[PDB]
Amino acid sequence: SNADPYIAVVSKGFQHKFWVTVRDGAEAAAKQNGVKISFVGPETESDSKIQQDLLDSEINKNPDAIAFAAVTGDFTEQIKRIKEKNIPLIGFDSGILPDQAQGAVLATASTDNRAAAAIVADKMFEALKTRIAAFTSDNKAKIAVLQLDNSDTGIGRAEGFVKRFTELADGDAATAGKYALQVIVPTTQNEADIANEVNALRGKSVLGIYLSNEAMARGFLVVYKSAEAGAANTIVGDAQDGGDLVVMGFDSGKPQLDAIRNGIIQGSVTQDPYSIGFQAVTLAYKASKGESVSNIDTGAKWYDKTNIDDPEIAKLLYE
Template structure:
């Protein structure tokens, strides 16, 4: 009996050990399965990340191959700062130049400061402004020099400081080599020649009929003899008119342009330049040449001079107008625009005028400056000039250039 009891107990003990062992194996299997699931999830996540990374790389490659909608637009660069030193602030022309400068700065994500003397005869004030701009160590400077010789040292200072200079309006002719990277400007001699060509078309008959005893006089009104742009327009007009008139022509009134013997020629080009750039002086100069005998036409080489021509013509009894209809009138041709000049062209007081594109001058100057600051190659840009009169003033391509 005892033997049988011993055998049963032994069997029970063995069965208990077997059950415990099986339970442990089951737990181990469960643990192994949990670990396998964790590993599988980790592997799945890793694969998902790799797939997403590959998708992003493919998208980036596609973007690089296919240009974006705004491809070709200026890249924003808020770190670039441009200093602009103009010839003045007093005329609407310079307001439009400033607008163009600001537009370019905005388009390229740059900053811009615009300054200029109160009067275009204040040469030293401009030199001081240029030196002040250099002291700020900008990325580039745009300069419309009143007198190139006066800024020679400043240009050398900028060059030594590694500051690119971009010329605009009349540019900076004769600057130290390498100091001026490029110019955004009107070809002023060509613009003056354009005025002469158009004016000659209405005075040709009288010019051909003129003799030394019955001279024809063509007046030229320039605000100064120092500004490169004014001198270029004046010289361009004179040179072209001399070419059109022929040998029997003399230039008088200013030693800067004097040529020929007035007493022996049929046509006289009479240049009037005021002692000071103010309204009283230029109006006096205008009256002096308009009151001379034989005047058939007058050319004014910028907005300031053109407004003086209109005022003075009115003060002298309204002598400007269509000479073909009334030979007591004098043909008038101006330069640039402004409300007074535009109205004078519209109502026939002036035969016409030459317009630049002041907004484009300012825009291209700052655009070139930003490119130069980035180390990109730049070159001169001719911003162009056009003749306008009452007939074509409403044309869209002209109207947009004739500011008020």
């Protein structure tokens, strides 16, 4: 309220420790602007019904504004009510799916998925361009894209890579026509479903694999477990040309970080969770004051063995 400023932040919960850092960012912005926040989310990201309930509970408080990062599910009833109550609504992280927003979402603070994925395409092209030139139109080099789902996030993290990789590889006459991108969506983001898709990529089948999220990386790591020559379940010698698989990811988490340290994954892109949270509350606060707001791109950064322990990179990663 005016006398006791209050903004509701409905998050994806703490299944993934990324969200501890987002909370830190949010609490910082809240203190800077003199506003109390709630920071509430489901126990796991599959608990859509509890996230619906928590969002309803917060709407009922008549907060000055709401910042929202939707898990998978249908929040149209809640967003419809927000719109009717004229509560300013901000998305953050993946925010509100566009087909649910109903004209009510003023602005969103988030990573640009397509741009982050394009960084991975740039690095993959760099790594594979000489290797691809050895293939032919009748026997193309293959790069697999493990797309996490058919949501806005999965589509954008896949499309961003595909668009940029195609631009680079068609633009270079030594590579054009000699490659094919294989876009694979596992039937769920559960372990067996992802591992079973990664199984078809064994045995000198592909040159590279792009892992669109942490769940993809975990599933991949069920199957590939070493970057030593001659070792069980190794990336070494298992590429389509008998070289080593070039595998790149997105986000972090301990299994992924260890895979980068151990040389199984060449590198990944990280988001800036603190900034996501800080900018979410900032936008919400400004919108609560009737100030004009606009989408904010919090960006993404490549990380690899060379910079993983740099303090400014380390602070973006999570276990």
